[PDB]
Amino acid sequence: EDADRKYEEVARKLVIIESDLERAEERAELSEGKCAELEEELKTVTNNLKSLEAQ
Amino acid sequence: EDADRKYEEVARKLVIIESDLERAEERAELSEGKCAELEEELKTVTNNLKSLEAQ
Amino acid sequence: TTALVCDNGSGLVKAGFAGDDAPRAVFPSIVGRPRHQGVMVGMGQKDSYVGDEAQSKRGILTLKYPIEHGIITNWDDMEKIWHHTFYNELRVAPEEHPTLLTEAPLNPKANREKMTQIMFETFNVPAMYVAIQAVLSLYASGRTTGIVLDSGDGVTHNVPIYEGYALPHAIMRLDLAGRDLTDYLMKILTERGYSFVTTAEREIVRDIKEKLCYVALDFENEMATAASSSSLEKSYELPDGQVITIGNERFRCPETLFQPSFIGMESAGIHETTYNSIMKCDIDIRKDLYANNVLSGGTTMYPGIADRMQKEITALAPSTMKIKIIAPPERKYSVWIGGSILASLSTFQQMWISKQEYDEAGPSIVHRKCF
Amino acid sequence: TTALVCDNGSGLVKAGFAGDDAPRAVFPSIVGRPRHQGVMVGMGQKDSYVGDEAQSKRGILTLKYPIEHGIITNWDDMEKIWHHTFYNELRVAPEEHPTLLTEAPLNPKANREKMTQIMFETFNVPAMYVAIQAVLSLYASGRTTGIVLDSGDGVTHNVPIYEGYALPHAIMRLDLAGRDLTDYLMKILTERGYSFVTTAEREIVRDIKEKLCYVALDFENEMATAASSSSLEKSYELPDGQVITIGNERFRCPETLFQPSFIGMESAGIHETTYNSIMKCDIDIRKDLYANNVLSGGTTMYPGIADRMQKEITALAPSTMKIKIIAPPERKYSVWIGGSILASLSTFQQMWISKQEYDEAGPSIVHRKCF
Numbered sequence A, B: 001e002d003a004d005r006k007y008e009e010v011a012r013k014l015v016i017i018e019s020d021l022e023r024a025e026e027r028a029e030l031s032e033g034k035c036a037e038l039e040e041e042l043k044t045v046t047n048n049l050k051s052l053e054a055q
Numbered sequence C, D: 001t002t003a004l005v006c007d008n009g010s011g012l013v014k015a016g017f018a019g020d021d022a023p024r025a026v027f028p029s030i031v032g033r034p035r036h037q038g039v040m041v042g043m044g045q046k047d048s049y050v051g052d053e054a055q056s057k058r059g060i061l062t063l064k065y066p067i068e069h070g071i072i073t074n075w076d077d078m079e080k081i082w083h084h085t086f087y088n089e090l091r092v093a094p095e096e097h098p099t100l101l102t103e104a105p106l107n108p109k110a111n112r113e114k115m116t117q118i119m120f121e122t123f124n125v126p127a128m129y130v131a132i133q134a135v136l137s138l139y140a141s142g143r144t145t146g147i148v149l150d151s152g153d154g155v156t157h158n159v160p161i162y163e164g165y166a167l168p169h170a171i172m173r174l175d176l177a178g179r180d181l182t183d184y185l186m187k188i189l190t191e192r193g194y195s196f197v198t199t200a201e202r203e204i205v206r207d208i209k210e211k212l213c214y215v216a217l218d219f220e221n222e223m224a225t226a227a228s229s230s231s232l233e234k235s236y237e238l239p240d241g242q243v244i245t246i247g248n249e250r251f252r253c254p255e256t257l258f259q260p261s262f263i264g265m266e267s268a269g270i271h272e273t274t275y276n277s278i279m280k281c282d283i284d285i286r287k288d289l290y291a292n293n294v295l296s297g298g299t300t301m302y303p304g305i306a307d308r309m310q311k312e313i314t315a316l317a318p319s320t321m322k323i324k325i326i327a328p329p330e331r332k333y334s335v336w337i338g339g340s341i342l343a344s345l346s347t348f349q350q351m352w353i354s355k356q357e358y359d360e361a362g363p364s365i366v367h368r369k370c371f
């Protein structure tokens, strides 16, 4: 019966940790997408500035 | 034996899922920091580009 | 007609019919002989017990396995095992049934050649074919790519496959398996005071292993836990009473898979062999191989082995790759399931080695393009 | 300061000082207790005799051995044995002498732990250390490479060593030894009408075995010659008379070492476990191991055992290899010789387990690097 109790509690903890990890993974996806776009934009604007300074 | 096997299995799952969560959170904070670096670098490069953009 | 799918391996013969969902007959591949003299006349004692019958008379027999590490060493015993499988467990006549046999990669050539010669001369099967135990696992897993780790009872091997093409130069084979884990557990149980020496107490030790052993996620932390507390100790009930209690030994036994130095081997662990087989392949398929680690066979059945293996191979691989370990609950029978699927396929009916083809070309027809 | 070297073994305690050529105290490890009534008042008799004193009063005592197969099964008796060895045979105060003890490979851990706990709490030695018997045999043999067969009185074992590195995965241990040979000789003497049932008659049978038994070079030809002629018959005079005549059981007794099926064991002979330990080792050292096969211990003292074992191992090994068996005349004491050498080595003085280390770490300090 104590095992029934602790199995229920670990199932609850299991679901909660699943939710935390799932949202953390979505957050990681959004942060990496922003990282990719920002690195690309840095490369492009440094291309523009090197061309302009070459003049 | 039924209850014991069930709870030991779920405890294994708990240890592995909390393991997942720890480094998920860690790498999330690292991605956040790197995103902050991209942000500040973007602001600085745009400032340089606009100041050069006068002529 | 119908085809037979016999998965010998070493330590468990499992056979059945092609098109079924599971093997019909599963029994140990042992052949026992009485080692005492026998006093009661009229008993009509037979001279050799094969199969599951030999497990009931363990007390008075001496058990031998006819297959050491994939390879067959006692051809007479193997002939007895095949005869038992055909006539007493399945109750079919092998004259009207094609037979699909399996073996592990990188075995001697005469093993497979003589297997063919027996299956045609002694048993007079109409056709036959020999398949690789890892390709069949990949069939039964529903993949067409992926690297498969088939840890049986005598041999462990990796076979990377991509889009149905096997890369033979990256195939690894390791002779550490369940039999060596059983011997290591027999050896380390001694440090608690229990001694199992007979070939018939090897079976008791194998049952102990199957029922109580598991893979630790962190070996050093589990070692410290067993040292400090006593929450890990479980008790087992020998065939005559005298309950034994094993603690530390529960995870020191299967840890030999990840540290083959415990039994004096120099090779690398299961995780490291898998990763080396990956890095042996081209660079364009490594991502899919990382994503499709398929485990099969009885030795992959410990609790925690998938989690441990994923943790290790994830620490090995680059941090940007998604590692997955495919561990179905019916792992132990994956080779047989895949063999049944393959033999029931329709395009496969042109791949059998017919009997006239054999009478024409000799046993060399097996390695030949009629593979 | 000097260290003591106590080689217990299972049936003959032999002790002394480190730095001598031989032990100065060799006596049986038996503890006798009177089993009869006791009528003479004022006789003031004791309750338990230990050692050689118990051998003079066999007709009155019941004799126990406190060590069955390497393992100590009676800690009170063993404490008595050690007390006798320290105070009556050697006459030294054990609180001012380090003590080197020995044990066989692959024993329980609690045996060793409880041994050191006794030696520190009860006898209060300043330091102590437990050594493997085969390693000390190899020290005394003057080698640093070889496979050593140490047949004592309770346990037989092989320990292959190369350049001072011991290969633990190839260590074999067998529970067939001199005590089982004595029991088998008692059992087969009844074929001629002699019956020895008492624990005090077990000693008569042991003396018979030591004085008359030998190993046959060819067992079948010796059985045939014993059946035909009568030139093998030898007589022995019991403590009274009725001289007993011993025929082919002169060599049927120690043949149990090469055919353990005689006493209903499943294992293989000592020649075959030696060869199996060899083939268990690597391949680059097997030649040296074949050439340095070292015998020690009392059960290796039969006339003809060296020639027999060479014949067997030579028939087993490849023909291009030269087999050699080293059998000194002081085999029975080789473990003690090696223990004395080792304890006198100046390098060893940093390897003792001091009393403070024990007090701070518990008896677990024994399996630690302080081995």
Ligand SMILES: Nc1ncnc2c1ncn2[C@@H]1O[C@H](COP(=O)(O)OP(=O)(O)O)[C@@H](O)[C@H]1O
Pocket: C007, C008, C009, C010, C011, C012, C013, C151, C152, C153, C154, C178, C179, C206, C209, C210, C211, C297, C298, C299, C301, C302, C332
């Ligand atoms: N639940 C389990 N846990 C650990 N080991 C197992 C388990 N079930 C079976 N085994 C081991 O797997 C081996 C059998 O593997 P198997 O797939 O039959 O290979 P093969 O067919 O070549 O004998 C046995 O030696 C057994 O010790």
Ligand SMILES: Nc1ncnc2c1ncn2[C@@H]1O[C@H](COP(=O)(O)OP(=O)(O)O)[C@@H](O)[C@H]1O
Pocket: D007, D008, D009, D010, D011, D012, D013, D151, D152, D153, D154, D178, D179, D206, D209, D210, D211, D297, D298, D299, D301, D302, D332
């Ligand atoms: N000359 C001999 N021939 C045959 N057996 C012997 C001889 N001398 C001693 N033994 C046997 O050796 C045994 C003692 O061996 P020992 O070296 O004392 O081992 P342990 O010290 O472990 O008891 C005795 O049981 C005895 O039967």
